[model samples]
Structures are given as C-alpha cells and as structure tokens.
Target: HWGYGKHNGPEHWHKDFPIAKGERQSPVDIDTHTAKYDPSLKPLSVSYDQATSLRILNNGHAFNVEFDDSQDKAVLKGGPLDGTYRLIQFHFHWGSLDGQGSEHTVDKKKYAAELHLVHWNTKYGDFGKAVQQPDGLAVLGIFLKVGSAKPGLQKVVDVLDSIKTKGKSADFTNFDPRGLLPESLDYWTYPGSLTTPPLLECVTWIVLKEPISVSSEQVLKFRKLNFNGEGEPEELMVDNWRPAQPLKNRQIKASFK
Candidate 1:
C-alpha cells in the first residue's frame, strides 16, 4: 500500500505509481511571490447541506467524512471552474505535532494540518467516471494553523476514540462541512493531481490563502487514531501528508490582489 513510511513514502511512490513522476503533481509549495493575480477568476461559491454528511470512517489512510451526492445538495461553483462540482468527501492530512504537517505550503511555510474537501464534476456523472477526465475534480485545500480551538473540529475529534483502527466507522449525519472553512475564500488556483495514490492528474486545486485555527491539544487527539487494523500493532496515524511536488510549468493564479 502507498503509505507515508520511509520505504513506501512519497519519494518511492514514483516506482509503483508511475504518474507520481508525471508533471502537474499536487500539494505544491504556493510561492506567493510567484503566484499571479487573475482578475478573471470569480469568487468561489460553496453551498453545503448539513444532511449530506453520512458517516466518518478510517480508510487506512486518513479518516474521511463521506457525503451523499445523489444530487447537488452540496456543491462548489465558480472560481476557476467550468461547471458545478458536487462534494463527495472531506479528509485531512496532519502532523504528529504542530511543527510540520500541511501538504501544500505558502511562501514555503507549512501549516499544522490541511483539510481537503473532495468534489466531482456533475458533467462526468460519478467519481469513477469523473476521476479520469481533466476537469473531473475540484478540491478545496484549507490550511490548518495551531492556535484557538476549532469548534467544528471538536465535533469530528470526538469520534476518533470510536474509530481508532483502520476500517472503523461511525454515523456522522447532520454535520455541515462548511464549518471547517476559513473566514475568507481567497485562494491560489492550479491544475494538479491528488496527493494520494492513483495520483491522477485530474484535480483543479483551489487552495485557500487564510488558514483556520486548530489547537495543539486537538491535534494530539488525532494521533490517538491508528493506521493499523484492529488485530495488528498500533501504528499512529500521523504525518499522512505527501511532501510538496514540483510546480513544473504550471502557473498558480491568485484570486485576490
């Protein structure tokens, strides 16, 4: 399995997943100095339905909050997108500590963690079908900085004890993913691939400029969750993020001046 361990880490991924070496890989360092302002980019419109959230599960990688996207009850529109993208699931990449965690960085500064709200374009039908198309996915990358407590995160962390092992899950309905967003939607837009395996080059990444607060104490709770299955040795599920990849020939555009 493609994991964050030394042997199968990001550096070794290119061997198994050839596309990991492909251009347009994700979780890039967003150098604000190099990022250009794009006046043509519109403000992002994110509309999330609380009822769309179904359950939270440990997928052996990061825990994910799955959503019901039978229709466009929760969707992301505008802001460098050609069509409405339906929210599928939301997950995080975190550090064992506050020093280094976030996958994408700004000015080479790493955040305590990162939140990714995965979405699929409605024009492509389902995730399987959409994932292969160039404009298939739209991921909202929200950086998490350590400081004040995040009330929304408190709601999520409360369930970690129950799903401590891989494949464990719990019902998580009526929780709106919108509460995790930063105050501003200002972002840097770039075409990239999923940070995780398959690493398909189909994501339209919208990385927010402002970071949301997540207390150090709360981050400790995340480490309580394990990467191993219930029967195996307890492996703490920390540092699940892939390091920043090359920007290659891609230009990152900023929504704000």
Candidate 2:
C-alpha cells in the first residue's frame, strides 16, 4: 500500500498511479506576493450543522472525522466554487516533528500542520460519482501554526487515545467543523488534484490565508499515532504531507487584496 515511508512515498507514487504526474496536482507553494487579487470573488458561505459529524477513523495515512452528507446538513458555497459542495470528511496532515509539516506553504514557509476538509459537489448526487469529474470536489486547506492551544481542537485530540493504531475507529458526533476555522475566510484558490492516490485531478483548492493556532504540546500528540496496525513494528504517523507540485500555467485567484 502507498504511504509516506521512504520506500513508498510521494516520489514513488507515479510507479503505480499514472495520474500522480498530471499537470494539475495539489499542495503547491503559494507565493502570496505575486498572487492575483480579484474583488469579484464572493465571500465563502459555509454552513455545517453539529449533528452531521458521525465518526472518526484511523485510516493509516491520517485520522479522519467523517460526516453524514446524505442531505445538505453541511455545505460550502460561494467563493471560487460554482455550486454547493457537501462535506464528507475532514482530516489532518503533519510532520514527525514541529515547524515543518503543512503541505501547502506560504512564501516557502511551512507550518506545524495542516487540515483538509473534503467536500464533493451535490449536483453529482454522491461523492463517489463526483470525484471522477473535473469540478467534482473542493478541499478547504487551513494551516496550523505553533502557538497558543486551540481550545476547539481539544475535543478532537482527546479522542486520539482511542484510535492510536491503524484501522481503529470510534463514534464522534455533534461537532461543528466551523469551530476549527480562522476568523477570516480570505483564501487563494486554484485548480488541483488530491494529494494522495489515485491522485485524481478533480479538486478545486481553497486555501485560507490566516493560520489557526495549535500549541507545541498538542502537535506532539499527533506524532503519537501509529501508521502500522497492531502486531506490525509501530511506524510513527507523521510527515504524511505530499511535496509541492509544479504550478504549470494555472492562475491562482485571491478572495482578498
């Protein structure tokens, strides 16, 4: 299986998944100094009901908080998106140590960690179907800086003890994902793909400019999770981020000046 280890990392992804070499890939470095600002872009509209949060799972690669997207309980519209995108899951990507983990960097500066909220276009009926089309998905990227502790994140961190190994899962309910976002919704958007395999080129990336705070102590807990399942030599689950991909000719539009 594909993982972030030296033998089966991002550099070797293309050996099995050809689309890993596609022109429109994700986790690109955002040069804010040169990013084009567009006043016409609408402010992002995100509505997430606390009841939509269903469960949390350790999928070996990263821990994910799954949502019940059966209806429009949690949805994202406006901004650079064409239509409503329903939330399916949210997850994190971090490094083995502090100071360098985020997949998307600003001015080549990486943060302690990064969070991804995955959503799929509702017009396509379901997530499985939507992921195949060009405008199928929209992933919200929020950088996690090392600073004061984020009280809102404590609820998530508290449950890590129960799912420390791969394939472990537990019930996680009534959590509002909005609590994890920054005060400002200002973002830079571009055409991109999923950072992991099958590396489909279907995502519209919306990366927020302001990073949320996470204490050093909290980030250290993330490294405690294991990549290998029970009985396997415990490989620390960190540095699960993909390297920044080439930008090609695509333009990045900013929602703020």
For 76-138, candidate 2 gives per-residue lDDT tens digits of 899989998999999999987777899999989998899999999999999999989999999
Question: What do the candidate models score in CA lDDT, each in turn?
Answer: 0.92, 0.92
In Å, residue 2's CA in model 1 sits off its true spot by 1.5
* Per-model TM-score on C-alpha atoms: 0.98, 0.98
Candidate 1 per-residue lDDT over residues 1-257, each given as its tens digit = 77999887889898889999888999899999989999999999998854389999999889999999898889999999998999999999999889788999998899889999999999999999998988999999999989999998888999888899999999998887878988899999999999999999999999999999988788988888899999999889999999899999999999998
Deviation (Å) of 3 in candidate 2 = 0.6
Show where candidate 2 strays beyond 4 Å: none
Which window of 10 residues has the lowest lDDT sum in candidate 1?
A: 45-54
For model 2 the TM-score comes to 0.98
- What lDDT does model 2 reach? 0.92
| Candidate 1 TM-score, C-alpha based | 0.98
Instruction: List CA RMSD, all candidates.
Output: 0.9, 0.9
